[PDB]
Design a protein around this ligand. Structure first.
Ligand SMILES: CCOc1cc(OCC)c(F)c([C@@H](Nc2ccc(C(=N)N)c(O)c2)C(=O)NS(=O)(=O)c2cccc(N)c2)c1
Ligand SMILES: [Ca+2]
Ligand SMILES: [Ca+2]
Lengths: 53, 254
């Protein structure tokens, strides 16, 4: 259920049936094996502030 | 920005400064290396598109520190539904002539998927709005980039909490209210086109565009922003298209 708590996804969420869902990440990020987390794959991924990171 | 504070240099890396003949025109948001989102009304009075410049990595307008990157604007795309002089569909997609180089001071804001933005981001109460606009209604503009945290209101609540005006333009589904009604904090005219950025689980996303208001930080009123989620598909399709001759392009919306 993507509508509730973002389906548990850190970023994007897609519902497949009433019991199946896939999380996805923006370009510049990759989904971790937990199936919900996104980790940067580039030096300057969108939406992150380098000096604070 | 009225009632906010200086955005520490580098902490608002997606902020864009648009200039016409060297003069401050509006703000904008970098969403990738060659695309910037701004407000359509920022271009109502352009006579010669070749005088339009976008600056990234900007912070202090009084000095050059080497982090600034300026680019000519190759294309300004506006929804077919936008009518100059009116408030609805206030969004513009700009293609830079050359991509900017991402650095600690130049980073794009994430353009979210429509579902994520409607189902999740729309419920994050506070978001940041920024720009070099007026520090006070009818006051001087800022020399350093300013930023302000503003809470979002459901439209029903915005209308109920706002004082009624005769000629007041309608708040459509392509807009949303954010701010305060005590006359202390709001974005302003010179911030037009700038970002309304929303944080979610460690990442920032574009949810709004500084669009309009009945004065800046007017008691009884809120700032009004373009509801970016309505345009995600429209923007994504355009970014996948080849550039066309002639700077201004009116593209079908939806
Ligand atoms: C689509 C833009 O429509 C407007 C309407 C406004 O008043 C309506 C009664 C308004 F003050 C602004 C204003 N932007 C703005 C931005 C933010 C605020 C704010 N209080 N947060 C706010 O109070 C105002 C603006 O840009 N005015 S303008 O003269 O430079 C201009 C240029 C080109 C087209 C238009 N429409 C306006 C723009
Ligand atoms: Ca500077
Ligand atoms: Ca480059």
């Amino acid at each position: 259920i993507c509508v509730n708590e973002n389906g548990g996804c850190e970023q994007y969420c897609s519902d497949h049936t009433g019991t199946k869902r896939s999380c996805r990440c923006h370009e510049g990020y990759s989904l971790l094996a937990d199936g919900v987390s996104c980790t940067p794959t580039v030096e300057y991924p969108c939406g992150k502030i380098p000096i604070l990171e | 920005i009225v009632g906010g504070k200086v955005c520490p240099k580098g902490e608002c890396p997606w902020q864009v400064l648009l200039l016409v003949n060297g003069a401050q025109l509006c703000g904008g948001t970098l969403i990738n290396t060659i695309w910037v989102v701004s407000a359509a009304h920022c271009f109502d009075k352009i006579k010669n598109w070749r005088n339009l410049i976008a600056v990234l990595g900007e912070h202090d307008l009084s000095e050059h520190d080497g982090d600034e990157q300026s680019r000519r604007v190759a294309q300004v795309i506006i929804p077919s539904t936008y009518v100059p002089g009116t408030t609805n569909h206030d969004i513009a997609l700009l293609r830079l002539h050359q991509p900017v180089v991402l650095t600690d001071h130049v980073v794009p804001l994430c353009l979210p998927e429509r579902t994520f933005s409607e189902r999740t981001l729309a419920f994050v109460r506070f978001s940041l709005v920024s720009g070099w606009g007026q520090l006070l209604d009818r006051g001087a503009t800022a020399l350093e980039l300013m930023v302000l945290n503003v809470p979002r209101l459901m439209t029903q609540d915005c209308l109920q909490q706002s004082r009624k005006v005769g000629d007041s333009p309608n708040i459509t589904e392509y807009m949303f209210c954010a701010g305060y009604s005590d006359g202390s904090k709001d974005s302003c005219k010179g911030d037009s086109g700038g970002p309304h950025a929303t944080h979610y689980r460690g990442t920032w996303y574009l949810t709004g565009i500084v669009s309009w208001g009945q004065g800046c930080a007017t008691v009884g009123h809120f700032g009004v922003y373009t509801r970016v989620s309505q345009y995600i598909e429209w923007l994504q399709k355009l970014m996948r298209s080849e550039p066309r001759p002639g700077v201004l392009l009116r593209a079908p919306f939806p």
